[PDB]
Design a protein around this nucleic acid. Sequence first.
DNA 1: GGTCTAAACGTCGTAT
DNA 2: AGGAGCATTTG
DNA 3: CAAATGCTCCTATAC
DNA 4: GACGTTTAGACC
Length: 292
Amino acid sequence: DNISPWTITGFADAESSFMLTVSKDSKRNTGWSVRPRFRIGLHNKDVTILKSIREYLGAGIITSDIDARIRFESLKELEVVINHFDKYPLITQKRADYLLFKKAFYLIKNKEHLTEEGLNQILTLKASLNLGLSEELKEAFPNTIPAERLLVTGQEIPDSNWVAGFTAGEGSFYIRIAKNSTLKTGYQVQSVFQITQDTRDIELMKNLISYLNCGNIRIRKTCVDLVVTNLNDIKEKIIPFFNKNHIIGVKLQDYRDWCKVVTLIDNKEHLTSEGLEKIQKIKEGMNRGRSL
DNA sequence: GGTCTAAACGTCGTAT
DNA sequence: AGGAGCATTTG
DNA sequence: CAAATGCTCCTATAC
DNA sequence: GACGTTTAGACC
Ligand SMILES: [Mg+2]
Ligand SMILES: [Mg+2]
Ligand SMILES: [Mg+2]
Ligand SMILES: [Mg+2]
Ligand SMILES: [Mn+2]
């Protein structure tokens, strides 16, 4: 069963990397090797997420050693990647990374990089890309101005599957058991839904809430969590949403278990000892407690 | 004051 | 998630 | 040859 | 990402 282009970019907003590697190479005429890359790497457990992305695009090399990756490094394969994101844009601050990457891509594809002028222009871009220029690259190209980075603002969720894609990456479905004397069982049971993202996209988080019509912002010193704790919102909004917009990967099974636990809470089995014991068993085979 | 939900407040460690 | 470079193939 | 791409190993904090 | 405890205060 094929994936949706929107869950792809959603997941890519969450997990993907756009990269430029600039390495010394005296064999080249500038003395420097310049290449672009696009990659997603994750736990071996989710090889099959990459496989469904590879089936979709018909491009990309998949590896599996200590982790599992899908990479696009040739021009032929990057054309496919750029055809994708021009048609289905990113909406996090990764958009800015992408626009820099795309800039550098054209330079390279057009061979404009085999040139002092090009090489320099490509560094301005690298300087503003993800982690910027390293201490040694800063030395090799002294006082090179970082290219202007688009501050990505006022973004509207383009498709509901974008959310399913993004929460497949940054989302979490867990059950919170709290030691509390004032409950007959001695514990509080709660269903929590969560999305996490660096504070630079707090704007985006704030209207995911508007999009879903539920949840609270939580700033932890920074990061931002979108947290839904309200049981009714989980019952009427979150579950039916993800029932329509499918999570991909192993998280699907955590979602199912979680969803099963919501029913139990809904039927109030969490207020009886047998209920609590049952939930604890499901919960312990869930997220961090699942296996091979 | 008993029982409970919501959510504020808190932290660990590795998948990404 | 993000990084860098040696190894090998290409034209 | 020199340029492109393959392959594989290093780093570390946003989730 | 996912696990844990404390606090505000609703409802009976
Ligand atoms: Mg991320
Ligand atoms: Mg994950
Ligand atoms: Mg990082
Ligand atoms: Mg993460
Ligand atoms: Mn992530």
